Amino acid sequence: SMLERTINLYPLTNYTFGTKEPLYEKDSSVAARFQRMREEFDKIGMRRTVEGVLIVHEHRLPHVLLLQLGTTFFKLPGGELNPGEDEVEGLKRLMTEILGRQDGVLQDWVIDDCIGNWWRPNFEPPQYPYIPAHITKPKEHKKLFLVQLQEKALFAVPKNYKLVAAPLFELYDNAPGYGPIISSLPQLLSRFNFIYN
Amino acid sequence: SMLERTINLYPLTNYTFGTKEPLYEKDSSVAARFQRMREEFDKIGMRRTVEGVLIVHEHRLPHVLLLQLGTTFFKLPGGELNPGEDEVEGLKRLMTEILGRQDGVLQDWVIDDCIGNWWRPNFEPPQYPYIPAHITKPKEHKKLFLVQLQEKALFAVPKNYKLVAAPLFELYDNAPGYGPIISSLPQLLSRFNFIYN
Numbered sequence: 001s002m003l004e005r006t007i008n009l010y011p012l013t014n015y016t017f018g019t020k021e022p023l024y025e026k027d028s029s030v031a032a033r034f035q036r037m038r039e040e041f042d043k044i045g046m047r048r049t050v051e052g053v054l055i056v057h058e059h060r061l062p063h064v065l066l067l068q069l070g071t072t073f074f075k076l077p078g079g080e081l082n083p084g085e086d087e088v089e090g091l092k093r094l095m096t097e098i099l100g101r102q103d104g105v106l107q108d109w110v111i112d113d114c115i116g117n118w119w120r121p122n123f124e125p126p127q128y129p130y131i132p133a134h135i136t137k138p139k140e141h142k143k144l145f146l147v148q149l150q151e152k153a154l155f156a157v158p159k160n161y162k163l164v165a166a167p168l169f170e171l172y173d174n175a176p177g178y179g180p181i182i183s184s185l186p187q188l189l190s191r192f193n194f195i196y197n
Numbered sequence: 198s199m200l201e202r203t204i205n206l207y208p209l210t211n212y213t214f215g216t217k218e219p220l221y222e223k224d225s226s227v228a229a230r231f232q233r234m235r236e237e238f239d240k241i242g243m244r245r246t247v248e249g250v251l252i253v254h255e256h257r258l259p260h261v262l263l264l265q266l267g268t269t270f271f272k273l274p275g276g277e278l279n280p281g282e283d284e285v286e287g288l289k290r291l292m293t294e295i296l297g298r299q300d301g302v303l304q305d306w307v308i309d310d311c312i313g314n315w316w317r318p319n320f321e322p323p324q325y326p327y328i329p330a331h332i333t334k335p336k337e338h339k340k341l342f343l344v345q346l347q348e349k350a351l352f353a354v355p356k357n358y359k360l361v362a363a364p365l366f367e368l369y370d371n372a373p374g375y376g377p378i379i380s381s382l383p384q385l386l387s388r389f390n391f392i393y394n
């Protein structure tokens with residue numbers, strides 16, 4: 001009769017957000033993005049993407065860490081696996097490439113929980129939390145994981161991004177603002193028993 | 198690097214849906230419903246509600262079992278805990294009262310997973326997957342659980358209800374049809390590794 005996973009949260013003021021050099025996107029436009037997805041599909045099949053959900057609290061209110069590219073899109077930290085790369089090692093590699101320190105001290109990433117799966121049927125924006133009817137060759141599969149933070153840490157934010165802490169109410173029913181994966185994080189996080197340290 | 202929970206699904210044709218006498222709602226109207234919630238809040242505080250999510254497949258496509266009252270609302274099987282009642286024993290009690298057999302043979306209910314939490318701030322329809330800002334006395338707290346079915350079973354459906362199997366695509370982004378809890382089941386179920394037996 002205690003079936004919820006227990007997750008420790010720490011205050012946002014426990015974390016230090018330093019700076020490092022810009023990290024440029026792999027694609028210069030939407031059209032370039034879907035051309036490269038089409039080219040790689042022909043060589044190695046479906047794109048395998050992993051993303052991390054990192055939580056803090058302020059005054060006992062959970063907040064998700066988002067990376068905002070300039071003043072455009074909000075992103076979760078993550079990216080593309082290489083062929084034959086383990087999903088959990090890969091997400092740890094990508095989070096170190098995005099938020100890892102200038103002084104080369106390693107973060108202690110802890111990943112123990114899957115919180116969802118999304119599939120892209122075509123070389124187009126629509127994504128779904130299932131494989132849609134009649135679709136045998138999805139073009140992309142995304143896997144989301146909860147990343148348990150340590151009590152304190154220093155993250156290095158690439159200079160072209162801002163790290164922003166968003167409360168759950170601002171994400172909720174806000175697909176226009178955040179799109180369909182980030183806007184459904186409130187519902188996906190509701191199963192956890194958060195401890196406010 | 199295998200962090201997903203594994204869940205066995207069986208075909209819908211493995212299950213027999215018999216009939217029994219009507220099960221009438223506790224409240225004859227929305228106004229009667231929120232009057233009784235207001236009366237009980239004053240005596241025992243917040244309403245504690247539990248609901249079950251029961252999954253099958255047909256042709257390897259997952260479907261959620263829904264109870265439709267005549268041709269109005271779709272419902273998950275569930276209901277109200279009594280004061281000091283355990284959540285998991287309570288859901289097993291309520292599922293036996295709704296779908297338990299006329300011949301008094303017990304179902305073997307297996308409940309091992311929480312899939313979400315919803316909170317009602319006021320004596321009004323709005324519900325959220327978090328406690329909203331400034332709300333210290335929520336009026337209702339709902340807990341949803343995944344109910345693992347056995348390979349075969351006979352359920353007795355009250356005569357005033359139809360048991361319906363809905364695919365995930367029909368629930369997805371369909372709050373008008375199903376409301377905000379049932380329409381977010383696709384996203385909440387995406388973390389499971391379903392086995393299609």
Ligand SMILES: O=C(NCCN1CCCC1=O)Nc1ccccc1
Binds near residue numbers: 076077098161
């Ligand atoms: O690439 C990321 N997430 C995977 C999903 N994608 C791909 C294109 C845009 C997007 O959100 N995230 C990310 C965040 C900061 C720096 C670098 C990468």
Ligand SMILES: O=C(NCCN1CCCC1=O)Nc1ccccc1
Binds near residue numbers: 246271273276295358
């Ligand atoms: O009561 C149920 N679920 C809890 C949430 N509520 C309360 C009012 C309507 C609603 O969906 N479910 C249910 C299903 C079949 C028969 C009897 C009960």
Ligand SMILES: [Zn+2]
Binds near residue numbers: 058059060
């Ligand atoms: Zn405070």
Ligand SMILES: [Zn+2]
Binds near residue numbers: 046141
């Ligand atoms: Zn895949």
Ligand SMILES: [Zn+2]
Binds near residue numbers: 256
């Ligand atoms: Zn078949």
Ligand SMILES: [Zn+2]
Binds near residue numbers: 243
């Ligand atoms: Zn509560």
